[PDB]
Structures are given as structure tokens and as C-alpha cells.
């Protein structure tokens, strides 16, 4: 329960709270998850909403989200989360992250980056110079 974790939890919560009301509905949780390549059913979305909503008001506020995310923490530098992060960036599933893919993901996180900025990120990471980023280069990044 460090300050770093709290900041990361807050940034995740703001991304999901698409209208800024301080809560996360079922449709918000759906919409953000699919923007990042996940394919949850409406059945699991309602279930995740009911599990985390403690007071039963039908939505998830930040303390409720915080209670949930504070237990059983995984690690963003773990190869398990690195693997799951590669699934997001490599959207078409060919095993290489392209600039349009990085552009599309950055767009879904709320970043307004020009195409030159994105191309620089690819270059700074592209070791073999093939113009894309594979798993090895993604990890070393």
C-alpha cells in the first residue's frame, strides 16, 4: 500500500470513469476493456460490477475499487503482466507492435500524440530496425 500503487490505482480509475462522476458503471467497464483488446461478456461485466460494488448501489466508487485492488496485487514488471500488456499493444496478433497499433492504444488511454512522436517511440525500441517491436524488444524497453 505505497503512494506509487495509489497513483497507479487512481490513473486506472480515471480511465474507466469516462464521464467523471466518481463511479464506474457496467458500460464504462465494458467500453474501456474493449478499447484495450479485452472481450468480456455482458454477463461477466455485471458480475464484476456486483462483486466490487460493496454497498450495492450498482456502481464502483474509488474506495470500493481501492479495497478490491489493494489485495492480491500482481506486478507490472512481472512477465505475466508484461505478456498481458503485449496482448494490448500487439492488437492484430501478429507478434509485432506497429506504429498504427501504438497510435491506437495511446489514443485509447487519452493521449493526443502526433505520428512523429509515436514513430520515435518505435525507433527507440526497435533493435533489429524492422520498423516494429516484437516481444524481446518490448521487454527490453
Amino acid at each position: 500500500l505505497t503512494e506509487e500503487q495509489i497513483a497507479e490505482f487512481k490513473e486506472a480509475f480515471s480511465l474507466f470513469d469516462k464521464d467523471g462522476d466518481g463511479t464506474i458503471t457496467t458500460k464504462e467497464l465494458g467500453t474501456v476493456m474493449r478499447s484495450l483488446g479485452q472481450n468480456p461478456t455482458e454477463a461477466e461485466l455485471q458480475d464484476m460490477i456486483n462483486e466490487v460494488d460493496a454497498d450495492g448501489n450498482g456502481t464502483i466508487d474509488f474506495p470500493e475499487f481501492l479495497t478490491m485492488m489493494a489485495r492480491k496485487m500482481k506486478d507490472t514488471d512481472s512477465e505475466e503482466e508484461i505478456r498481458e500488456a503485449f496482448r494490448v499493444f500487439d492488437k492484430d496478433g501478429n507478434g509485432y507492435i506497429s506504429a498504427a497499433e501504438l497510435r491506437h492504444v495511446m489514443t485509447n488511454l487519452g493521449e493526443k500524440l502526433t505520428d512523429e512522436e509515436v514513430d520515435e517511440m518505435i525507433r527507440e525500441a526497435d533493435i533489429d530496425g524492422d520498423g516494429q517491436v516484437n516481444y524481446e524488444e518490448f521487454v527490453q524497453m
Partner: peptide
């Protein structure tokens, strides 16, 4: 019923991880 708890965390940690690398990529460049 704690499978749902597990799945929420897993889905969320992927988002947190993605955000962390997007921030870090912006941080390098």
C-alpha cells in the same frame, strides 16, 4: 464466486501495466 474477483484484478492489472508502459514510453521520448 471469488473467480470473478480474480478476473477483475487480472483485467485491471493489464490496464495498469499498459498505462505504466505508455507513461514510460512517453518518459523515454
Amino acid at each position: 464466486g471469488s473467480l470473478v474477483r480474480k478476473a477483475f484484478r487480472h483485467r485491471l492489472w493489464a490496464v495498469i501495466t499498459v498505462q505504466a508502459y505508455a507513461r514510460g514510453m512517453i518518459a523515454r521520448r
